[PDB]
């Protein structure tokens, strides 16, 4: 007979099987669609998660109960060292999907890139890449011409510079970024012109932009069904434990139906977050990157005592509204929105009012060490 009362099932089916991700680095499943009229441009950008802070923002939004006042909001910080482009890829459409036609490389690639195509850089003789890199410019042009003639999508091979970060690893993160824009010729022109130079975030995004964020979730190992799926606990009296589901299916059909949740891996899952607004795009050179019109104090984004487990941001950075998947020290992939966004949110202009730089190790009392020293006075 039917169950006595009805509830939604615990947990979405839509992410099963809940196994570990293949790779630490994220992957774009799909890019924005290529609207012809727009100029050639990058669609994605690679970054590292540094931590969260809070921000204070004044709200325009009319007819809201909140309305005029400033509000306090959580926000994430993603350090973005400028990407270096190293290769050009041309794909062509077949009934059996996209197949790569050829790839053309730059005339140099740095050691941080090179390290990724090895496991054991110290032990190796470091003989990778050198002879292909040599081959003369006519050859490159011939392949480019072949790409130019037939290919339907062009993507650029970009990489992170992890030495411009405080992170432990020196094997760079390589990732492909699709180019959307004009004619194949223009697309090719833009990548060729870009090629061996370095690409900062300001070239890819704009203030007030809405962005999609792709990241691998925080790991927990194997976790119990209650934790992993949200199942309500059984009563105390229960003989063989309580923290476990009380049925795993009917007698017929005579197998465990998959839909019932069981114990297992939790976290280290791939996840695509949509529609997060960028509140500010920092500039490395500026001393006043975390300053505001309201504050007028000289200070950097890096909070007092440094970010927990990430320390000191030193390059350019994105201050992103709210939260985004995965841990401290994790790579984050930024992606452009699939369709240009037409919401009342997407038009809006965020004049942020204050950025906290107090501690996130214990409960911060000051915005800088200079403030702290001033507050106490002479000490031993």
């Amino acid at each position: 007979s039917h169950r006595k009362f009805e509830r939604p099932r615990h947990g979405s089916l839509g992410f099963l099987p809940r196994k570990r991700c293949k790779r630490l680095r994220g992957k774009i499943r799909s890019f924005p669609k290529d609207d012809k009229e727009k100029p050639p441009h990058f669609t994605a950008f690679m970054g590292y998660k540094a931590g969260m802070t809070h921000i204070v923002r004044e709200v325009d939004k009319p007819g809201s109960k909140l309305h005029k006042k400033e509000i306090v909001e959580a926000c994430t910080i993603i350090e973005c060292a400028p990407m270096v482009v190293v290769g050009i890829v041309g794909y062509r459409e077949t009934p059996k999907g996209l197949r790569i036609l050829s790839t053309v490389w730059a005339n140099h690639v740095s050691d941080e890139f090179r390290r990724r195509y090895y496991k054991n850089w110290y032990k190796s003789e470091k003989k990778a890449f050198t002879k292909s890199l040599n081959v003369p410019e006519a050859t490159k042009n011939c392949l480019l011409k072949r790409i130019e003639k037939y290919c339907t999508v062009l993507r650029a091979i970009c990489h992170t510079q992890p030495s411009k970060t405080p992170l432990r690893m020196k094997k760079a993160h390589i990732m492909e970024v699709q180019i959307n824009g004009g004619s194949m010729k223009e697309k090719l022109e833009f990548v060729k012109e870009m090629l061996e130079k370095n690409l900062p975030v300001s070239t890819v995004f704009n203030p007030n932009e809405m962005i999609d964020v792709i990241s691998v979730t925080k790991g927990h190992g194997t976790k119990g069904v209650v934790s992993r799926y949200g199942v309500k606990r059984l009563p105390r009296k229960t003989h063989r434990g309580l923290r476990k589901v009380a049925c795993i299916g009917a007698w017929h059909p005579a197998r465990v139906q998959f839909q019932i949740p069981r114990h297992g891996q939790k976290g280290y899952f791939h996840r695509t977050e949509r529609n997060k607004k960028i509140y500010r795009i920092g500039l490395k050179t500026d001393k006043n990157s975390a300053s505001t019109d309201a504050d007028i104090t000289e200070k950097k984004i890096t909070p007092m005592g440094g970010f927990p487990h990430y320390g000191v941001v030193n390059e350019d950075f994105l201050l992103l509204k709210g939260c985004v998947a995965g841990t401290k020290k994790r790579p984050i992939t930024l992606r452009k929105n699939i369709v240009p966004q037409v919401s009342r949110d997407a038009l809006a202009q965020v004049s942020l009012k204050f950025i906290d730089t107090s501690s996130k190790i214990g409960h911060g009392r000051f915005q800088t060490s200079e403030e702290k020293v001033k507050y106490y006075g002479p000490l031993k």
């Binding site: 309201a294 007028i296 204050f354 906290d356 009392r365």
Partner: protein, 62 residues
């Protein structure tokens, strides 16, 4: 920019940090941190805890 000021501590409160307690009388108390909040709740007089700024002011130790 401006900062509120604490009641139990004399510390300055940057926005988005501490908590607010309204007493039955209608008196609002702003505490910078949880520790200050518990100390107040248990009804310690601030001028008797040596670390806290209030003692320093009282004991001519400024």
């Amino acid at each position: 920019v401006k900062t509120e000021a604490c009641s139990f501590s004399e510390y300055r409160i940057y926005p988005g940090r501490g908590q607010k307690y309204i007493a039955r009388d209608g008196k609002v108390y702003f505490y910078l941190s949880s520790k200050f909040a518990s100390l107040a709740l248990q009804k310690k007089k601030a001028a008797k805890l040596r670390w806290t700024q209030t003692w320093r002011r009282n004991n001519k130790k400024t």
